[PDB]
Amino acid sequence: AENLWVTVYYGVPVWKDAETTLFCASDHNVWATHACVPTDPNPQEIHLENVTEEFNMWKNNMVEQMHTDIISLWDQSLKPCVKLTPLCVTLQCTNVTNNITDDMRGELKNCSFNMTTELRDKKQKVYSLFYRLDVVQIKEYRLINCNTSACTQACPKVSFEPIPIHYCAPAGFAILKCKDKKFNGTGPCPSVSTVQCTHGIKPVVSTQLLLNGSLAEEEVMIRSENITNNAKNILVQFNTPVQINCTRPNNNTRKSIRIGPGQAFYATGDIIGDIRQAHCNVSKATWNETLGKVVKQLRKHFGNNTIIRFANSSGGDLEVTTHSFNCGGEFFYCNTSGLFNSTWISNSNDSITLPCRIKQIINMWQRIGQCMYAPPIQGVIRCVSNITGLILTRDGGSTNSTTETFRPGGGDMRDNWRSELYKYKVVKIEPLGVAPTRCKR
Amino acid sequence: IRSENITNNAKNILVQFNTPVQINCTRPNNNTRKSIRIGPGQAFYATG
Amino acid sequence: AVGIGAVFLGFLGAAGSTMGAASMTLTVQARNLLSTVWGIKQLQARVLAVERYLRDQQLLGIWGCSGKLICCTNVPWNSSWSNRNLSEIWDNMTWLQWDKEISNYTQIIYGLLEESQNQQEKNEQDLLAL
Amino acid sequence: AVGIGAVFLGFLGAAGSTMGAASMTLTVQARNLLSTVWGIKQLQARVLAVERYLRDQQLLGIWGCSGKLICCTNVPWNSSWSNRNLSEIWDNMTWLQWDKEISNYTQIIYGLLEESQNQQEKNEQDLLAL
Numbered sequence A: 001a002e003n004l005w006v007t008v009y010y011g012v013p014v015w016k017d018a019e020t021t022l023f024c025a026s027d028h029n030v031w032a033t034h035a036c037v038p039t040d041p042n043p044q045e046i047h048l049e050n051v052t053e054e055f056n057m058w059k060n061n062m063v064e065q066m067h068t069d070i071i072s073l074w075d076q077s078l079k080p081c082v083k084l085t086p087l088c089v090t091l092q093c094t095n096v097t098n099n100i101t102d103d104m105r106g107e108l109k110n111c112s113f114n115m116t117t118e119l120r121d122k123k124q125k126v127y128s129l130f131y132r133l134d135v136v137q138i139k140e141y142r143l144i145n146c147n148t149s150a151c152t153q154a155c156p157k158v159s160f161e162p163i164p165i166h167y168c169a170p171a172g173f174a175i176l177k178c179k180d181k182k183f184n185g186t187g188p189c190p191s192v193s194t195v196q197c198t199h200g201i202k203p204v205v206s207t208q209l210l211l212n213g214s215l216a217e218e219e220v221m222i223r224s225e226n227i228t229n230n231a232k233n234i235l236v237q238f239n240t241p242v243q244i245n246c247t248r249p250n251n252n253t254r255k256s257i258r259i260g261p262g263q264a265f266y267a268t269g270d271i272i273g274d275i276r277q278a279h280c281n282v283s284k285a286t287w288n289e290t291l292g293k294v295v296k297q298l299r300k301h302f303g304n305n306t307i308i309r310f311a312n313s314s315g316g317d318l319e320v321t322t323h324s325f326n327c328g329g330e331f332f333y334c335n336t337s338g339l340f341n342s343t344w345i346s347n348s349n350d351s352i353t354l355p356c357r358i359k360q361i362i363n364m365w366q367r368i369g370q371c372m373y374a375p376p377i378q379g380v381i382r383c384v385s386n387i388t389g390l391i392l393t394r395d396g397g398s399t400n401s402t403t404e405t406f407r408p409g410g411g412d413m414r415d416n417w418r419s420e421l422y423k424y425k426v427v428k429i430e431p432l433g434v435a436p437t438r439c440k441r
Numbered sequence B: 001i002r003s004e005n006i007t008n009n010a011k012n013i014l015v016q017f018n019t020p021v022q023i024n025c026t027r028p029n030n031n032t033r034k035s036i037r038i039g040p041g042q043a044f045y046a047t048g
Numbered sequence C, D: 001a002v003g004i005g006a007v008f009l010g011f012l013g014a015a016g017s018t019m020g021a022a023s024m025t026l027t028v029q030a031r032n033l034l035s036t037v038w039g040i041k042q043l044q045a046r047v048l049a050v051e052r053y054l055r056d057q058q059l060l061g062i063w064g065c066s067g068k069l070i071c072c073t074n075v076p077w078n079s080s081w082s083n084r085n086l087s088e089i090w091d092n093m094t095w096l097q098w099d100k101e102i103s104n105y106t107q108i109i110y111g112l113l114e115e116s117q118n119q120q121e122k123n124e125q126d127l128l129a130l
């Protein structure tokens, strides 16, 4: 009676969730663009009407792929140049006290040691300036890493500056982007587009502060996998940036020592002029306004008549306890204590200065047994950056008290990538379909 | 009993049993182990 | 004829369109399907895509619809699978919604198609025997 | 309708069966064909399998039997190849024995099939010219 018959169609627009491997698209650097394809001058986007998709930032497979690719590129970049095997010798060290302030006392050590030469039957006597965090007493000191493993030197010619990278999908797969504002990273998105691939993402490595990121188009956004649980970090995205100016003012000097055939070690000769502490500056009124916006948004989730406290970091390693970043090739670790120190109750030109330290022996990723020795940078260094987000954690959270305390956090670098790839997902097409029609073979 | 060419004496003979024979092997010395650090993250294990 | 622009449809430009309108853009989707360790991964992805395409082509051939994008068959449509009439399907619904609705009636349809094709082949072979 | 179970025939399940019964399980065999240094070996094996499948499909298409598992043709059967009747072939012999028997008469059959297909195509082209 129906007289309707099955009919097969190939190439229908139907897709499903899937996982695959995206490839490069990017316009001497650590993040090698040589093995990455050039990007198209005019990217294309197709807005899908009447299509509402499901999104979840906390179960995105692209973050893991990005992390693995970044680590792999990092590993490849450090291969073809010197390994600092002979650096582990007994060092005779003294204090540096030539034109220093009251806060830099004991932070620098003038050390002398013996070293090999190009000929294996000759030795030389050399000296260099080391940081207090790099040497451990055995008047005799040794490098911190020799009792764990020998490890390489940073390679002078490659630069650490991040560059954008785009991830484009293979054939048979599509990338869907959610353009709905106020999207908190999980749930249904009604506005959807198909993009060949994403906007340029800078792999910025930092802790406790997201630098050179993206800004929300509507207002401050707060995201968390389970806001009720205190064990999950909270990601805060600003709508406007906060300028921060960091500097190392010491006039450093660099010298080269030939430690073998075609092998040179770069040491710090001496500092010309006064010695002062590297430090950063951030505006006070702008920070206060940003914190006001943040607490206003937090009151939406944590009650309207609750006291919100910003306090100091709990503790642990220097990297997790301090905002760690790279400026001008030098690794800064800084004590963001003057920022997250206040309490908020429901109801000109000075700037906050953070004095802070530099390091040379680096364990970038959370791994044990591989360092990275950064050669010194000659001369004064200054660098300006934008702060566009925060990674907070709720302390305690019991029902005994009516006050919520938030502290800075970090450590894991997957959260840094999660803040950029939150609005993208990958799907695979299902060309085959069956429908009713009135033929008969 | 299996062999590629049983007549030839240059070919090994494989014998497969139908039941096993238990064998008990032992070293009864109470050895002691110590570690010597021979370099950065390199340890050699010696008999004390 | 002077002042009107022209453009081409995208890979998934007809996703939001109705089934009747979306069925006229099968070639745009069909064409896209074909086209140290990183090289291994790319080669594996390409080989997997080729294998999937070959499997789809073989499945189409098993039903007797080889070398066609649209091939309407002899299997009748059961009312249990869907009760909506044609007017409410090809003019008021999209392909995604249709796939969602009948997602739990596909394997039986495939089996019926295979059996019908086998019966047709047997009947044709018997007819050619005369 | 209660008291009996159901199982599915496996790969090469009809190897010992007669040709007539074994010809009804072509799909199970057909479907199986498609689906650091070790990765190279596996990729090479997959590519070789794909190439073999494509070569077989091209050979089938050359004879005009494209997209078909059973395709009976116009070439008459010579008595020299085999004098056995149908009753002694499709009901008393297996595919392995049949392949063993006529192993030395295959290339001539392939050439005859190719020539017959070429002649049929030429005749069809001549007919369509009118």
Ligand SMILES: *[C@@H]1O[C@H](CO)[C@@H](O[C@@H]2O[C@H](CO)[C@@H](O[C@@H]3O[C@H](CO)[C@@H](O)[C@H](O[C@H]4O[C@H](CO)[C@@H](O)[C@H](O)[C@@H]4O[C@H]4O[C@H](CO)[C@@H](O)[C@H](O)[C@@H]4O)[C@@H]3O)[C@H](O)[C@H]2NC(C)=O)[C@H](O)[C@H]1NC(C)=O
Pocket (backbone or CB within 6 Å): A159, A160, A161, A162, A204, A211, A212, A325, A326, A327, A328, A329, A377, A378, A379, A383, A384, A385, A386
């Ligand atoms: C957030 O973004 C902002 C802006 O995008 C970033 O700020 C920029 O940072 C870059 C990199 O530090 C900086 O570019 C440098 O400017 C210096 C001053 O002009 C240059 O001297 C420097 O060139 C040296 O380094 C290059 C490698 O990066 C070498 O290729 C080049 O030859 C130079 O090296 C010579 O000099 C050194 C030092 O004397 C010596 O050791 C070498 O042997 C060689 O002789 C770069 O061009 C931009 O100027 C910054 N822009 C602004 C507006 O400040 C900021 O860093 C980002 N934030 C984070 C956290 O990354």
Ligand SMILES: *[C@@H]1O[C@H](CO)[C@@H](O[C@@H]2O[C@H](CO)[C@@H](O)[C@H](O)[C@H]2NC(C)=O)[C@H](O)[C@H]1NC(C)=O
Pocket (backbone or CB within 6 Å): A096, A097, A098, A110, A111, A127, A270, A271
């Ligand atoms: C670090 O120590 C070295 C060695 O003691 C210092 O180099 C000496 O500097 C004095 C001048 O103050 C010269 O007279 C000596 O000849 C130098 N010694 C050598 C071996 O060259 C160096 O000045 C010290 N640097 C700092 C910052 O204290």
Ligand SMILES: *[C@@H]1O[C@H](CO)[C@@H](O[C@@H]2O[C@H](CO)[C@@H](O)[C@H](O)[C@H]2NC(C)=O)[C@H](O)[C@H]1NC(C)=O
Pocket (backbone or CB within 6 Å): A090, A091, A092, A112, A113, A114
């Ligand atoms: C570099 O090596 C020389 C010798 O090759 C060291 O001088 C010796 O120092 C020890 C003390 O550790 C004395 O007991 C020896 O008598 C010294 N020998 C000579 C010939 O002077 C020198 O100390 C080494 N340099 C450093 C910085 O340790």
Ligand SMILES: *[C@@H]1O[C@H](CO)[C@@H](O[C@@H]2O[C@H](CO)[C@@H](O)[C@H](O)[C@H]2NC(C)=O)[C@H](O)[C@H]1NC(C)=O
Pocket (backbone or CB within 6 Å): A226, A228, A229
């Ligand atoms: C978010 O976290 C809270 C706190 O853990 C979860 O609620 C708890 O769930 C566990 C499950 O075994 C219970 O034992 C606790 O008693 C619950 N505590 C409270 C305060 O409810 C909550 O389920 C999480 N959210 C989701 C969606 O899983």
Ligand SMILES: *[C@@H]1O[C@H](CO)[C@@H](O[C@@H]2O[C@H](CO)[C@@H](O)[C@H](O)[C@H]2NC(C)=O)[C@H](O)[C@H]1NC(C)=O
Pocket (backbone or CB within 6 Å): A245, A246, A247, A279, A280, A281, A351, A353
């Ligand atoms: C951070 O702010 C301090 C002031 O709080 C700056 O110190 C001044 O720096 C200027 C340089 O142009 C000098 O002229 C002043 O004499 C300094 N004043 C004091 C009190 O130190 C410092 O330079 C700023 N640093 C950065 C990186 O912005």
Ligand SMILES: *[C@@H]1O[C@H](CO)[C@@H](O[C@@H]2O[C@H](CO)[C@@H](O)[C@H](O)[C@H]2NC(C)=O)[C@H](O)[C@H]1NC(C)=O
Pocket (backbone or CB within 6 Å): A243, A244, A245, A281, A282, A283, A351, A384
């Ligand atoms: C960070 O540095 C920038 C530039 O080095 C500062 O911006 C300058 O501020 C002065 C004083 O208001 C102006 O005269 C300049 O025109 C500004 N230049 C630029 C490029 O903006 C900024 O004030 C500094 N911020 C902090 C907190 O130290």
Ligand SMILES: *[C@@H]1O[C@H](CO)[C@@H](O[C@@H]2O[C@H](CO)[C@@H](O)[C@H](O)[C@H]2NC(C)=O)[C@H](O)[C@H]1NC(C)=O
Pocket (backbone or CB within 6 Å): A312, A313, A321, A335, A337
């Ligand atoms: C956050 O502020 C507290 C309070 O000042 C810091 O606690 C101090 O820690 C130092 C050791 O580094 C002690 O000498 C002080 O006595 C402590 N203060 C008090 C009042 O007891 C805490 O260290 C700060 N956080 C970080 C990461 O430095």
Ligand SMILES: *[C@@H]1O[C@H](CO)[C@@H](O[C@@H]2O[C@H](CO)[C@@H](O)[C@H](O)[C@H]2NC(C)=O)[C@H](O)[C@H]1NC(C)=O
Pocket (backbone or CB within 6 Å): A335, A337, A338
């Ligand atoms: C981070 O900065 C804060 C603020 O300067 C430090 O807290 C001070 O620590 C010293 C320790 O010598 C105390 O004497 C001060 O009283 C502390 N200030 C206050 C306001 O309590 C803190 O120690 C710094 N972090 C680290 C690890 O040193």
Ligand SMILES: *[C@@H]1O[C@H](CO)[C@@H](O[C@@H]2O[C@H](CO)[C@@H](O)[C@H](O)[C@H]2NC(C)=O)[C@H](O)[C@H]1NC(C)=O
Pocket (backbone or CB within 6 Å): A212, A241, A384, A385, A386
């Ligand atoms: C910090 O943020 C400001 C504002 O977002 C940036 O200035 C903008 O830069 C973009 C570059 O694509 C321009 O299109 C805008 O017109 C600029 N806006 C203003 C108000 O200047 C600035 O470049 C950022 N700095 C860093 C280092 O990222």
Ligand SMILES: *[C@@H]1O[C@H](CO)[C@@H](O[C@@H]2O[C@H](CO)[C@@H](O)[C@H](O)[C@H]2NC(C)=O)[C@H](O)[C@H]1NC(C)=O
Pocket (backbone or CB within 6 Å): B005, B007, B008
């Ligand atoms: C098994 O081994 C025997 C011993 O080698 C083979 O017999 C020999 O074959 C060689 C071939 O040149 C002769 O020169 C010897 O005189 C033969 N000796 C004997 C005692 O027969 C025998 O052929 C082997 N079996 C097979 C199947 O090859």
Ligand SMILES: *[C@@H]1O[C@H](CO)[C@@H](O[C@@H]2O[C@H](CO)[C@@H](O)[C@H](O)[C@H]2NC(C)=O)[C@H](O)[C@H]1NC(C)=O
Pocket (backbone or CB within 6 Å): B024, B025, B026
């Ligand atoms: C192998 O056999 C010998 C005996 O031929 C065993 O020696 C005895 O071991 C037991 C251990 O429980 C002692 O109590 C006896 O006193 C031993 N007797 C002698 C004569 O040595 C030996 O232990 C056996 N070893 C194994 C591994 O089975």
Ligand SMILES: *[C@@H]1O[C@H](CO)[C@@H](O)[C@H](O)[C@H]1NC(C)=O
Pocket (backbone or CB within 6 Å): A094, A095, A105, A106
């Ligand atoms: C170097 O200075 C530090 C800090 O004042 C002090 O603790 C240390 O004992 C000094 N070492 C010397 C003078 O050898």
Ligand SMILES: *[C@@H]1O[C@H](CO)[C@@H](O)[C@H](O)[C@H]1NC(C)=O
Pocket (backbone or CB within 6 Å): A136, A147, A148
């Ligand atoms: C190396 O020395 C430091 C300080 O002396 C110590 O904390 C660390 O545990 C040592 N490494 C190992 C592998 O024991």
Ligand SMILES: *[C@@H]1O[C@H](CO)[C@@H](O)[C@H](O)[C@H]1NC(C)=O
Pocket (backbone or CB within 6 Å): A182, A184, A186, A187, A188
């Ligand atoms: C915010 O995230 C929660 C997570 O459970 C989700 O339920 C909610 O729908 C999100 N907000 C919006 C507007 O979708």
Ligand SMILES: *[C@@H]1O[C@H](CO)[C@@H](O)[C@H](O)[C@H]1NC(C)=O
Pocket (backbone or CB within 6 Å): A251, A272, A379, A380
């Ligand atoms: C650092 O020292 C060098 C060498 O004396 C000098 O040329 C340069 O001007 C100094 N830098 C500053 C900022 O004074």
Ligand SMILES: *[C@@H]1O[C@H](CO)[C@@H](O)[C@H](O)[C@H]1NC(C)=O
Pocket (backbone or CB within 6 Å): A337, A338, A339, A341, A342
């Ligand atoms: C923290 O805030 C309190 C305000 O009560 C202030 O007295 C103290 O100096 C601040 N400390 C820092 C390190 O900013």
